[PDB]
CSV table of C-alpha atoms and ligand atoms in Angstrom, one decimal:
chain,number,residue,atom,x,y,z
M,1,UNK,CA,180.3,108.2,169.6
M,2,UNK,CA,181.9,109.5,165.9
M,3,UNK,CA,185.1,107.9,166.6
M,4,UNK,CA,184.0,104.8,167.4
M,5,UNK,CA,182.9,104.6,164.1
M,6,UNK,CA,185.3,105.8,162.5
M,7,UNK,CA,188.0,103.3,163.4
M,8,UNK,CA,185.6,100.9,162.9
M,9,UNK,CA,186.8,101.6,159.4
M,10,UNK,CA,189.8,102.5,159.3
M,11,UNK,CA,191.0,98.8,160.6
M,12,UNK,CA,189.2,98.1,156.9
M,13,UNK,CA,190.6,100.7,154.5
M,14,UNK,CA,193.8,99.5,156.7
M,15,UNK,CA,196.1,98.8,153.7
M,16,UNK,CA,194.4,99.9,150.2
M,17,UNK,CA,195.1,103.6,150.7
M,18,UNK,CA,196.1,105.4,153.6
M,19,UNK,CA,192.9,105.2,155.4
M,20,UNK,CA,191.8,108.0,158.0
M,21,UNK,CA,190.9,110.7,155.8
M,22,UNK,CA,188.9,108.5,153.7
M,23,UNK,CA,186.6,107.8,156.4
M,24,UNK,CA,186.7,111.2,157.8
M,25,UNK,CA,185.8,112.7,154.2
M,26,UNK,CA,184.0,110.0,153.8
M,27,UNK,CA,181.7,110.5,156.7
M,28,UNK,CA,182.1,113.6,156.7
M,29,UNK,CA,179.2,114.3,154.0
M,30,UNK,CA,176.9,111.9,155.9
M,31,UNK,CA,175.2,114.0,158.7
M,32,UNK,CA,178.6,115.1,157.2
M,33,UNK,CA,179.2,118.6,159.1
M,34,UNK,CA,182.7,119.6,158.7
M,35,UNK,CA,186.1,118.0,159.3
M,36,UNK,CA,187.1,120.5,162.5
M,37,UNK,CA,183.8,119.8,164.2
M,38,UNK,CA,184.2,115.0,163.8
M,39,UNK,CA,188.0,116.3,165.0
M,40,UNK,CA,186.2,118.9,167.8
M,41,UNK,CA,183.2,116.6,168.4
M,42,UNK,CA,183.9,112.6,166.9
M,43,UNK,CA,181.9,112.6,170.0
M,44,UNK,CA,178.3,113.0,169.4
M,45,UNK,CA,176.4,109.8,167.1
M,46,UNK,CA,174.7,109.1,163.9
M,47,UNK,CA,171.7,107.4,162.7
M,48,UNK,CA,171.6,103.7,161.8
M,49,UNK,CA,170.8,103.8,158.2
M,50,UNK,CA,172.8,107.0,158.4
M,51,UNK,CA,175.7,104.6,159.5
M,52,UNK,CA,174.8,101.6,157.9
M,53,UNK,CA,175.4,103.2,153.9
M,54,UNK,CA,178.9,104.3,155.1
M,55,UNK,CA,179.6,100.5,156.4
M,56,UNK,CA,178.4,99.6,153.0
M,57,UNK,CA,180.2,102.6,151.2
M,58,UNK,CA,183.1,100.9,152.5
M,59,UNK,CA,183.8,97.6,150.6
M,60,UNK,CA,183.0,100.1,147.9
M,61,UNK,CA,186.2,102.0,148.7
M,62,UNK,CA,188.2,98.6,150.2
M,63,UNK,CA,188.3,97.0,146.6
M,64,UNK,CA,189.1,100.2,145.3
M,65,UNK,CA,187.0,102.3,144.1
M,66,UNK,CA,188.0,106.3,144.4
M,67,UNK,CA,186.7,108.2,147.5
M,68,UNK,CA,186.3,110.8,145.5
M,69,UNK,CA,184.0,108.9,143.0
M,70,UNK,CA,181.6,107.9,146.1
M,71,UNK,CA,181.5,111.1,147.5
M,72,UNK,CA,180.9,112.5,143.7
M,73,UNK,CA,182.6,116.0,143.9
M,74,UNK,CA,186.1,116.7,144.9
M,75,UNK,CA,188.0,119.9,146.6
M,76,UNK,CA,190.0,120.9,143.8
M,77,UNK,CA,193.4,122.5,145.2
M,78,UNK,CA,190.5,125.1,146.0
M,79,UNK,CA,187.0,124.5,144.6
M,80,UNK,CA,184.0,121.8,145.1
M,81,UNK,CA,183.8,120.5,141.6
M,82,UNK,CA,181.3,117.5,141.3
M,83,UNK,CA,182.8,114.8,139.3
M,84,UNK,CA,181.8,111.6,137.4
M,85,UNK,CA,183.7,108.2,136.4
M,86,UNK,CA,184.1,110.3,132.5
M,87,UNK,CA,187.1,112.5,133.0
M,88,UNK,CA,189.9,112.7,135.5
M,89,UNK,CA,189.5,112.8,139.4
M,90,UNK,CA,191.3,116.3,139.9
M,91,UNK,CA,195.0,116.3,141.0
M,92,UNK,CA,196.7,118.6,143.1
M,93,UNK,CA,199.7,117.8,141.5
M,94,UNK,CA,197.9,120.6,139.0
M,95,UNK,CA,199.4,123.3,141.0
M,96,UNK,CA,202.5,124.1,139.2
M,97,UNK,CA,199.9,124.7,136.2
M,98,UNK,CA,197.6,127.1,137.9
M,99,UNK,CA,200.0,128.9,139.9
M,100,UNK,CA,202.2,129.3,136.7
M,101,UNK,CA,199.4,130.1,134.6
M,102,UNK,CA,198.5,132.6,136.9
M,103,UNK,CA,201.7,133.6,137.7
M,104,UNK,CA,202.1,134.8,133.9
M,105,UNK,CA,198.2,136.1,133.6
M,106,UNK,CA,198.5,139.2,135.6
M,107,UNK,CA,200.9,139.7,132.7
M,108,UNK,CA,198.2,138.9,129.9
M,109,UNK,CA,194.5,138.3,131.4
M,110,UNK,CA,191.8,138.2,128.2
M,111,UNK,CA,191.0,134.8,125.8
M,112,UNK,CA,192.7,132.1,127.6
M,113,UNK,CA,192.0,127.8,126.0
M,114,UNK,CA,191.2,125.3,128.7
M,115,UNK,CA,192.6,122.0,126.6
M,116,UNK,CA,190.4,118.8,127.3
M,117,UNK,CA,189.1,120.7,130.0
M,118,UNK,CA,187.8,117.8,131.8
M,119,UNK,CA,185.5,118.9,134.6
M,120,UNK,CA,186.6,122.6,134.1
M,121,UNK,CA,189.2,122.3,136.7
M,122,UNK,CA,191.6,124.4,135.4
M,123,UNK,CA,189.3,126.7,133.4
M,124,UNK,CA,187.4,127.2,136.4
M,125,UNK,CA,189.8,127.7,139.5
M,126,UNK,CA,191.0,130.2,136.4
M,127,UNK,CA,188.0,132.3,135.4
M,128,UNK,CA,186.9,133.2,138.7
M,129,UNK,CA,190.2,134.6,139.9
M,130,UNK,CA,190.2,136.3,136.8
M,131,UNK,CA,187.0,137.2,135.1
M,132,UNK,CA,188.6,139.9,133.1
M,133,UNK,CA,189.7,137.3,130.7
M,134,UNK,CA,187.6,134.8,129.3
M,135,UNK,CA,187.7,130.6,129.3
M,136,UNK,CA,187.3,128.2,127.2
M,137,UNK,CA,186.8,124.3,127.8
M,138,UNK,CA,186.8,121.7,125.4
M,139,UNK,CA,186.5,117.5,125.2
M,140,UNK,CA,185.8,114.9,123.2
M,141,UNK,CA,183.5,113.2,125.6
M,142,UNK,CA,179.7,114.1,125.9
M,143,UNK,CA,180.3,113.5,130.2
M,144,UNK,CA,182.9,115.7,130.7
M,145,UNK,CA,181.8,118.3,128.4
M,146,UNK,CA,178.5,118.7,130.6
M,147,UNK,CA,180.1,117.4,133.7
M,148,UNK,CA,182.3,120.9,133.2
M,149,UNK,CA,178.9,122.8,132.5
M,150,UNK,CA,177.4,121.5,135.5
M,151,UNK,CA,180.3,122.7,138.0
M,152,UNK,CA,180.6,125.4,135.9
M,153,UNK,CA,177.2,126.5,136.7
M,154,UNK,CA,177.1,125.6,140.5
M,155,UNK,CA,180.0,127.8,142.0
M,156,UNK,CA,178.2,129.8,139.1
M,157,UNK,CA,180.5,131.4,136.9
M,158,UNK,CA,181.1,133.6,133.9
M,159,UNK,CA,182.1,134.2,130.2
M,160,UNK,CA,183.5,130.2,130.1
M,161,UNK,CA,182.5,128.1,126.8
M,162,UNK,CA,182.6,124.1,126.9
M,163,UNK,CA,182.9,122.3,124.1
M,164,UNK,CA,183.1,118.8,122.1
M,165,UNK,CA,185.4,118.6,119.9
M,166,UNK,CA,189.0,117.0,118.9
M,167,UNK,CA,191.3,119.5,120.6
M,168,UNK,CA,191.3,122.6,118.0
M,169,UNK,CA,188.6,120.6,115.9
M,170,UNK,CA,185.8,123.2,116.1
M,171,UNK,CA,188.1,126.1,116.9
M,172,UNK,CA,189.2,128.8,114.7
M,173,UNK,CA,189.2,131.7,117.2
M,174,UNK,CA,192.7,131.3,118.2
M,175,UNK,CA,193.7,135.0,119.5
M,176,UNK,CA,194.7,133.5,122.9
M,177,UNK,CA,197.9,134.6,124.1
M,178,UNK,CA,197.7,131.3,127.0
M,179,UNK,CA,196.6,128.3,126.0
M,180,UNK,CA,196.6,125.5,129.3
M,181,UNK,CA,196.5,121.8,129.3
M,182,UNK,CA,196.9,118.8,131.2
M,183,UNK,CA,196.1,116.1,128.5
M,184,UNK,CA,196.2,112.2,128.8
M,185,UNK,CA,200.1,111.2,128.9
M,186,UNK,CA,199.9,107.9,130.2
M,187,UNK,CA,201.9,104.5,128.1
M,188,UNK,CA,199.7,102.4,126.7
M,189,UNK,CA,201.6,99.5,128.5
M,190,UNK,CA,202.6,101.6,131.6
M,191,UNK,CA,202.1,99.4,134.5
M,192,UNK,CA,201.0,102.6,137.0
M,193,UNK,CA,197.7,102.4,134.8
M,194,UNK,CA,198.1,99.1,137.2
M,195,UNK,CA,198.2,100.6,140.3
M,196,UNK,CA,195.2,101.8,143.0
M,197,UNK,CA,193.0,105.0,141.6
M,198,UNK,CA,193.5,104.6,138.1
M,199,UNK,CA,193.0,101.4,137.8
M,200,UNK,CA,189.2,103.2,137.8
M,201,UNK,CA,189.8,106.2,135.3
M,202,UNK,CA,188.8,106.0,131.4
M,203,UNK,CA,191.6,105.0,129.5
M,204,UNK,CA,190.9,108.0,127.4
M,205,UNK,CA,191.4,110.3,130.2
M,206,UNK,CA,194.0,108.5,130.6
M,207,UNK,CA,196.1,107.3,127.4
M,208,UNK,CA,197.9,108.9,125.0
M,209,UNK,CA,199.1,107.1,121.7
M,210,UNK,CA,203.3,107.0,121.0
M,211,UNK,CA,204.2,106.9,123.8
M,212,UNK,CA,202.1,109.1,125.9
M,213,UNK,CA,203.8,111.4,123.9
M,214,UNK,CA,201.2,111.5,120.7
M,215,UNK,CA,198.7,114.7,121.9
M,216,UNK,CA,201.3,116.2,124.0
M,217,UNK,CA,203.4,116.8,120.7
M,218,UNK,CA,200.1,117.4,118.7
M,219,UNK,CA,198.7,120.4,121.0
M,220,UNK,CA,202.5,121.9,121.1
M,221,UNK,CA,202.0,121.8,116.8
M,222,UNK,CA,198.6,121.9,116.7
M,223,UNK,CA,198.1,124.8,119.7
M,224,UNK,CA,200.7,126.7,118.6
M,225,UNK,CA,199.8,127.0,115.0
M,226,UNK,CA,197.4,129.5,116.8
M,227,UNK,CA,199.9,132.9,116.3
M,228,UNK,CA,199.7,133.6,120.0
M,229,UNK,CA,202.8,135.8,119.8
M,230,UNK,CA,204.2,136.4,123.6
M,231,UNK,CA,201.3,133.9,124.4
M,232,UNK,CA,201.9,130.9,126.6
M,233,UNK,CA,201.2,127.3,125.9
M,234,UNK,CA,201.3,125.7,129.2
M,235,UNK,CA,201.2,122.2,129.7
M,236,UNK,CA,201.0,118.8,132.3
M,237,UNK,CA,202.6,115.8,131.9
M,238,UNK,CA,203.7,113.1,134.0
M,239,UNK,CA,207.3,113.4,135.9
M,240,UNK,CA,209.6,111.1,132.9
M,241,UNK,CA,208.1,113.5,129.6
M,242,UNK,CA,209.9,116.6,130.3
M,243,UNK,CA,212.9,116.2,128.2
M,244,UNK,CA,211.0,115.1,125.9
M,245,UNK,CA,208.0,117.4,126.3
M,246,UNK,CA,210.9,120.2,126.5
M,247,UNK,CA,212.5,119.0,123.0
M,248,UNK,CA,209.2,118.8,122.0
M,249,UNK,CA,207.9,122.4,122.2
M,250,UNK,CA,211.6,123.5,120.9
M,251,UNK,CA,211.3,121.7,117.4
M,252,UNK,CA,207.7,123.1,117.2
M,253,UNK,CA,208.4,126.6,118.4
M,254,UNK,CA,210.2,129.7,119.6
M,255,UNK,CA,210.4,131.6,122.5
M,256,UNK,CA,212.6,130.2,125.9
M,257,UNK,CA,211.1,127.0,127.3
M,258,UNK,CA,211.0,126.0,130.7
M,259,UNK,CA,210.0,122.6,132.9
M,260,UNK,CA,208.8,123.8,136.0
M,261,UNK,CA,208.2,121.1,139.3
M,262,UNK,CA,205.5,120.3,140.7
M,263,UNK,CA,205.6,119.6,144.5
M,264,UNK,CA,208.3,116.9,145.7
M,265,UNK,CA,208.8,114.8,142.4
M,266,UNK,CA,209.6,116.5,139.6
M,267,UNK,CA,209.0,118.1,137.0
M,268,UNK,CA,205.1,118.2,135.9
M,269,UNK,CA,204.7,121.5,133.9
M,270,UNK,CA,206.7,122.8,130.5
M,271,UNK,CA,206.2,126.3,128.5
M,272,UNK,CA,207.1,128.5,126.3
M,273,UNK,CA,206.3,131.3,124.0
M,274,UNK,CA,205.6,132.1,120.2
X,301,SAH,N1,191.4,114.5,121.3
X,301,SAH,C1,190.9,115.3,122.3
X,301,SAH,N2,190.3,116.5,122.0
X,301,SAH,C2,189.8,117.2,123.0
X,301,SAH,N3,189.8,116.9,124.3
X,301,SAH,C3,190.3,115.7,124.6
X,301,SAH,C4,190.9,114.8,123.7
X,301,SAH,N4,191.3,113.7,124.3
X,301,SAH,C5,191.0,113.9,125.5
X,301,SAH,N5,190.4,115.1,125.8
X,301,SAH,C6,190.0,115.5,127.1
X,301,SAH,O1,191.1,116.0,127.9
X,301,SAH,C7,191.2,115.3,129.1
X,301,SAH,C8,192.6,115.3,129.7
X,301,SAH,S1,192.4,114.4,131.3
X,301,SAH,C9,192.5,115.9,132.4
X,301,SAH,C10,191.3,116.8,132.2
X,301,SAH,C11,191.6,118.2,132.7
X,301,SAH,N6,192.5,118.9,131.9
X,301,SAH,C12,192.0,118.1,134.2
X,301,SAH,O2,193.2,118.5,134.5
X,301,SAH,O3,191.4,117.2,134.9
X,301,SAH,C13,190.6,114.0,128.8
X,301,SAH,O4,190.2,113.3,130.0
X,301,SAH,C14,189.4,114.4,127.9
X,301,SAH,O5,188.3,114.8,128.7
């Protein structure tokens, strides 16, 4: 049967992640059918070769390597969006971003900045609930750039720009009233760029320079040079920079600022107004 099969694996994946819905996920893109049918039927088989790849797919995963990276696209919080080893592996710890962001766009829809966009992520799940405003993406890394452009094309959607270029590099078209970001703000010495997943990310999606402060600060000045006025400069960054991302956008700018959680931990968003 399915099952059978499964657990084969999980005794495997036993202590490197937490292992069923690897497998699951896993296999599930193999005759891979759905997740509610292997739960409704782990019961009917699959081919050898079929079977054999996963069993191979599987050291892959047990030394480390992402799921996600294997399987080569990933459910954003609500999209497929194909990824590739260039750019980040989409959180959903990016929840507090969108929801915010959107949560403050009914208030101010048109010209919205996608910051190191990534894979379009943000910029996407974004634009397609609201198309009356337009998106822009941006990177400094030829994959990602594209990488966006592909998923951008696939789910097919409108009005969005990509871009290479250092942050606001080639930009000069700054009448955006929300500008969005979840930049690299990682230690260079941290020892969580140590641990599991990320030992497999880019270091530049990863690392920012003083300490993990350095583009954090420099969109905040940088972004906010833009005369937004009302506009919002939301931004990510891990769970220890909000005091300091919160001083941050105060000694660069104006209206009330605000660190909003995430889900359990903490703090992951910070914004404000000019
Ligand atoms: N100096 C720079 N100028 C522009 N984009 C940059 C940059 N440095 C990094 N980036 C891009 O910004 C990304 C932040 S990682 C997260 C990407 C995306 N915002 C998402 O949430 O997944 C980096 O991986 C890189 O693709």
């Amino acid at each position: 049967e399915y099952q059978h099969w499964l657990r084969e694996a999980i005794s495997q994946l036993q202590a490197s992640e937490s292992p069923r819905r690897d497998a699951e996920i896993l296999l599930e893109h193999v005759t891979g059918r759905g997740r509610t049918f292997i739960l409704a039927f782990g019961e009917t088989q699959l081919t050898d070769e079929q079977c054999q790849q996963l069993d191979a797919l599987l050291t892959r995963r047990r030394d480390g390597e992402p799921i996600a990276h294997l399987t080569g696209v990933r459910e954003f919080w609500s999209l497929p969006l194909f990824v590739s080893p260039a750019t980040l592996i989409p959180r959903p710890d990016t929840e507090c971003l969108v929801e915010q962001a959107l949560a403050r766009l009914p208030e101010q829809p048109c010209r919205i900045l996608d910051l190191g966009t990534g894979t379009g992520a943000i910029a996407l799940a974004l634009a397609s609930e609201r198309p009356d405003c337009e998106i822009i993406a941006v990177d400094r890394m030829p994959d990602a750039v594209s990488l966006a452009q592909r998923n951008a094309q696939h789910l097919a959607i409108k009005n969005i720009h990509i871009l290479q270029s250092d942050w606001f590099s080639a930009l000069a078209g700054q009448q955006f009233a929300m500008i969005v970001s979840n930049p690299p703000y990682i230690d260079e010495q941290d020892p969580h760029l140590q641990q599991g997943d990320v030992r497999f990310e880019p270091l530049t999606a990863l690392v920012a320079a003083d300490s993990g402060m350095a583009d954090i600060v420099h969109i905040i000045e940088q972004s906010r040079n833009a005369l937004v006025s009302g506009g919002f400069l939301l931004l990510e960054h891990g769970w220890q920079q909000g005091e300091a991302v919160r001083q941050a956008f105060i000694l660069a700018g104006y209206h009330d600022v605000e660190t909003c959680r995430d889900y359990g931990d903490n703090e992951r968003v910070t914004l404000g107004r000019y």
